[PDB]
Amino acid sequence: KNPISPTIPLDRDGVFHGFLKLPHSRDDSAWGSVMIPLTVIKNGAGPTALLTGANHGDEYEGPVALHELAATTSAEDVTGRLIIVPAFNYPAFRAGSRTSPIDRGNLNRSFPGRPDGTVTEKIADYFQRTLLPMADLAVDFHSGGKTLDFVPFAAAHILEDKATQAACFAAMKAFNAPYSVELLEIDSAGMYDTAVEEMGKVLVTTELGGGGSSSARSNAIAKKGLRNVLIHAGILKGEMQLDETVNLTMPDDDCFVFSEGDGLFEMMIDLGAPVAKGDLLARVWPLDRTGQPPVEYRARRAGLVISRHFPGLIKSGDCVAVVGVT
Ligand SMILES: *NCC[C@H](N)C(=O)O
Ligand SMILES: [Zn+2]
């Protein structure tokens, strides 16, 4: 029995604004709670979509779209059910950080979680055992965060069940981000991705920009894809917006480049720009001194720069850049 209990019904017709109340006894509140905001919109019979933003706290395109959806959608617009959680790892979202300030918990590495663990593990357990079985479709928004920046794209995994792999790709096509990706997310343990997919459910995941900020273009991409995906699922009516998309893959480790030293980061080729094998991706300047040649990082695969280290300061082990193919 997970101690979380909603403040609103999850199975009644109408529009509900309430919270997932997670008890949390702590120094600044002895009988306190984490009040995870959520909106349930239900109307008649139909599929149920579980919509999450801010799985990592410092990623904002999702929470912006889900807040708008929770505030501008009437029950009559829906055939089915929307479960809307704009801030998924809510303590991290309130702290403005990828991980939670309470337990340093990475929510996207905490599944299946446990009902008696950390605050983050209790969140993961509740979606693992209570919310996901209620859902047919799961849209889990992601962006680069303060340390990464991505080309705006929706992704689907090469997974072993080809039936629900096909369903995931169909929803990615419906999302219609400017780029479309099959992510090399090996290192697959503990993710919400893996929880949804292993249940045979439909998963939509994204990487919409980054840097700890969202733009009007990037907010719009999140709003379009969300609307398309809900129409594609049968929950919302209307005409889908179909624009051009570029298909990209990550077949290899050599799509990735990590830095081996700290310094001042100079990106030499912008996001989304084409790159050939061996082209100079970035150079890192010394923090300590002047007049020394920069440390050069070169592409090991041709394609497009789909991700880059965001901050001006880079550390050893940070991912300099990622190349997407075609
Ligand atoms: N490969 C999955 C995306 C990653 N966990 C992130 O940067 O959010
Ligand atoms: Zn993320």
Locate the ligand 1 atom nearest the alpha carbon of residue 187 and give its number. 1
Question: Which residues neighbour ligand 2 (ion) by CB within 5 Å?
Answer: 56, 142
Q: Number of structural domains, the chain? A: 1
68 annotated as ligand-binding: no
56 annotated as ligand-binding: yes
The three state secondary structure string of the chain is CCCCEECCCCCCCEEEEEEEEEECCECCECCCEEEEEEEEEEECCCCEEEEECCCCCCCCHHHHHHHHHHHHCCHHHECEEEEEECCCCHHHHHHCCCCCCCCCCCHHHCCCCCCCCCHHHHHHHHHHHHHHHHCCEEEECCCCCCCEEECCEEEEECCCCHHHHHHHHHHHHHHCCCEEEEECCCCCCCCHHHHHHHCCCEEEEEECCECCCCCHHHHHHHHHHHHHHHHHHCCECCCCCCCCCEEEECCCHHHEEECCCCEEEEECCCCCCEECCCCEEEEEECCCCCCCCCEEEECCCCEEEEEEECCCEECCCCEEEEEEEC
Distance 237 CA to ligand 1 centre (A): 31
Of 304, 254, 300, nearest to 277 by C-alpha is: 300
Q: How many C-beta atoms lie closer than 10 Å to residue 55's C-beta? A: 26
Distance 108 CA to ligand 1 centre (A): 8
Separation CA 262–CA 266 (nearest Å): 12
Write the CB contacts of 80 (distance below 8 Å, at least 6 apart in sequence): 42, 43, 44, 45, 46, 47, 48, 49, 233, 234, 235
Ligand 1 in reach of 185 Cβ (< 6 A): yes
The token pair at 321 is 């850049």
Q: Nearest ligand to the C-alpha of residue 52? A: 2
Ligand 1 in reach of 142 Cβ (< 6 A): yes
Range of the domain at 56: 1-326
Separation CA 295–CA 3 (nearest Å): 51
CATH of the domain at 274: 3.40.630.10
Q: Whose CA is nearest to atom 8 of ligand 1?
A: 142
AA letter at 292:
Q
Distance 141 CA to ligand 2 centre (A): 8
